[PDB]
Ligand binder design. Structure first.
Ligand SMILES: Nc1ncnc2c1ncn2[C@@H]1O[C@H](COP(=O)(O)OP(=O)(O)NP(=O)(O)O)[C@@H](O)[C@H]1O
Ligand SMILES: Nc1ccc(-c2cc(Cl)c(Cl)c3[nH]c4c(c23)CN(C(=O)CO)CC4)cn1
Ligand SMILES: [Mg+2]
Ligand SMILES: [Mg+2]
Ligand SMILES: [Zn+2]
Length: 342
């Protein structure tokens, strides 16, 4: 009942939803119209992503993630430095070519420049993530991310990813792998290799979260109201609260809600049946998520759900001392019934 009461507090107000949805639409629509006038961005289209469009945004609808996707035919990818997730792209995009290489930084710079010049709305741009980040009315943040869309087969680094066959089905895995993949202008470390792009499957994360049960009717009727999204919301709030309490501790700076989202997908793979997420077992299901995440921190292993050889918890990305620090705080919370929720 304590956790149910937490979830009630995390619910988004209907009035805040209605107001925020309109504020975002006015800004997104204006920017799309302007970008389409530029020869380079003429084919841009909207793809809504992230927690709001997955219905796992908590507390307030004050942060929205959108991709401005651009179909680019006939791309050839070259993996950068065995990073598994970062690539060079080769083939009105000639202005962005360095030789045969399509520069992520040059395309992002023009995209940001156009947005900056274009912004009944108070809109400011936050300093230069692949996103151009806007703040509407001092309240609503919007991450606008240029994304190249490729309709080709997914890169080889994904061959063993997306291990959903025992949960969502092999047929679904095959359908999802026929969808496009995206490249966003987030550069690999080098200093950054400023031509490099990063693979993204944010659209598939949304597809899974909004169609998340083994039963096709999961969450469509009162007898099948599972606790999967509630558990992700509680894990997100646990991490948010810890990061806020420890905001002056560097140890928590590199953790993000994507770490809990990725751990959560792995728990769904481990626990594929809807009866393992029954509403009446909320506390146990949340505990399964917390203990799984603790195991990831201890073993220093959290594979990207789509790119298994990309380890989000590698010491190259997050120091061992930082993972041990977060382990200590989560263990204290688990051992004391989550006082950070009170
Ligand atoms: N480290 C990462 N690796 C890959 N994709 C990422 C990473 N961080 C963020 N993303 C993607 O960017 C999207 C938006 O990021 P963000 O707004 O930080 O998180 P979110 O999923 O929307 N949850 P929230 O904290 O509620 O905003 C995520 O849903 C992911 O698809
Ligand atoms: N609309 C979207 C969706 C997906 C991506 C995105 C994609 C990839 Cl592959 C990576 Cl590694 C990413 N890292 C970050 C993001 C991102 C976006 N992001 C936030 O949204 C912070 O609130 C920062 C950090 C970007 N914008
Ligand atoms: Mg978000
Ligand atoms: Mg964001
Ligand atoms: Zn469900």
């Amino acid at each position: 009942s304590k956790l149910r009461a937490v979830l009630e507090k995390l619910k988004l107000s209907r009035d805040d939803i209605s107001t925020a949805a309109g504020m975002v639409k006015g800004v997104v629509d204006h920017l799309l119209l302007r970008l389409k006038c530029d020869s380079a961005f003429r084919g841009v289209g909207l793809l809504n992503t992230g927690s709001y469009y997955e219905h796992v945004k908590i507390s307030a609808p004050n942060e929205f993630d959108v991709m401005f996707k651009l179909e680019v035919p006939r791309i050839q990818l070259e993996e950068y430095s065995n990073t598994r997730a970062y690539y060079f792209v080769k083939f009105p995009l000639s202005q962005f070519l360095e030789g045969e290489i399509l520069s992520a930084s040059k395309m992002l710079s023009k995209f940001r420049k156009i947005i900056k010049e274009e912004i009944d709305t108070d809109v400011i741009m936050k300093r230069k993530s692949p996103a151009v980040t806007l703040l509407i009315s001092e309240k609503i943040s919007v991450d606008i991310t240029l994304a190249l869309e490729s309709k080709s087969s997914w890169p080889a680094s994904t061959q063993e990813g997306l291990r959903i066959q025992n949960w969502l089905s092999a047929k679904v895995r095959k359908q999802l792998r026929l969808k496009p993949f995206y490249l966003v202008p987030k550069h690999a470390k080098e200093g950054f290799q400023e031509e490099t792009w990063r693979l993204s499957f944010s659209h598939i994360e949304k597809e899974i979260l909004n169609n998340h049960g083994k039963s096709k009717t999961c969450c469509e009727n009162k007898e099948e109201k599972c606790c999967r999204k509630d558990c992700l919301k509680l894990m997100k709030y646990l991490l948010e609260q810890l990061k806020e309490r420890f905001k002056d501790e560097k140890h928590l700076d590199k953790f993000s809600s994507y770490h809990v989202k990725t751990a959560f997908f792995h728990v769904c793979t481990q626990n594929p049946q809807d009866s393992q997420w029954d509403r009446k077992d909320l506390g146990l299901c949340f505990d399964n998520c917390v203990t799984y995440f603790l195991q990831c921190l201890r073993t220093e292993k959290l594979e990207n759900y789509f790119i298994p050889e990309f380890n989000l918890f590698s010491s190259n990305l997050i120091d061992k001392r930082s993972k041990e620090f977060l382990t200590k705080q989560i263990e204290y919370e688990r051992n004391n019934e989550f006082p950070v929720f009170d």
